[PDB]
Amino acid sequence: EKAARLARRIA
Amino acid sequence: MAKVQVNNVVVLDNPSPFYNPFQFEITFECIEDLSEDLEWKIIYVGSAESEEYDQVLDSVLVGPVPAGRHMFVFQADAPNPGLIPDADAVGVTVVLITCTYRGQEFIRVGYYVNNEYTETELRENPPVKPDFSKLQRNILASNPRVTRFHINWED
Numbered sequence A: 001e002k003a004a005r006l007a008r009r010i011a
Numbered sequence B: 001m002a003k004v005q006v007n008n009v010v011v012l013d014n015p016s017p018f019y020n021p022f023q024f025e026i027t028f029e030c031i032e033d034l035s036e037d038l039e040w041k042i043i044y045v046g047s048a049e050s051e052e053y054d055q056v057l058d059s060v061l062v063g064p065v066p067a068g069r070h071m072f073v074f075q076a077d078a079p080n081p082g083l084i085p086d087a088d089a090v091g092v093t094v095v096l097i098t099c100t101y102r103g104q105e106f107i108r109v110g111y112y113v114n115n116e117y118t119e120t121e122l123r124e125n126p127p128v129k130p131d132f133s134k135l136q137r138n139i140l141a142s143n144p145r146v147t148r149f150h151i152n153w154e155d
Helices: A002-008 B120-124
Strands: B004-011 B022-030 B038-045 B052-061 B069-077 B091-101 B104-117 B135-139 B144-148
Touching: A002 B091, A002 B104, B004 B104, B022 B038, B022 B091, B038 B069, B052 B069, B069 B104, B104 B120
Parallel strands: none
Antiparallel strands: B004 B022, B022 B069, B038 B052, B038 B091, B091 B104, B104 B135, B104 B144
16 A cells, blocks of 8 residues: 555656 | 656765755756746655655745756755654655646656665664664665646746
8 A cells, every 4th residue: 555655646 | 838848857876875865967948938937846755644744855946947958956955754654764655856837736756765774683673763864765766757747838
């Protein structure tokens, strides 16, 4: 879930 | 249409101690004598869980921008560890480099950052409370993420 959240931030 | 185009971002001084300031060499192109300033920001994601733990390391206004190719080194002090949740201090996080024109963000360059202890004992047995003086920031600079957004460039 940390990787999914970090990916949303970069988008 | 898009008056500004970011051509390249280079990660300087990497890896480095956690406390060293961030350094990005940015190259951009400007189509005309851009009327308003460009606002560049370096934002540190302190916690993947919430946007409230973001730290804007620096916000810079570049301008008047004459038409042409430009390059500069954007330097910003390291994040305040006192605002970072311990659970998110060690391991992967993200640093963002954004540019905004007339209050509209048009580009976001993201880099995954991996904060890790340099001593083997600390890597295998991390302290209960993170020791930012022993953390190394390893930015995953071979894999940048670029996202562009449609904005209103007209005056």
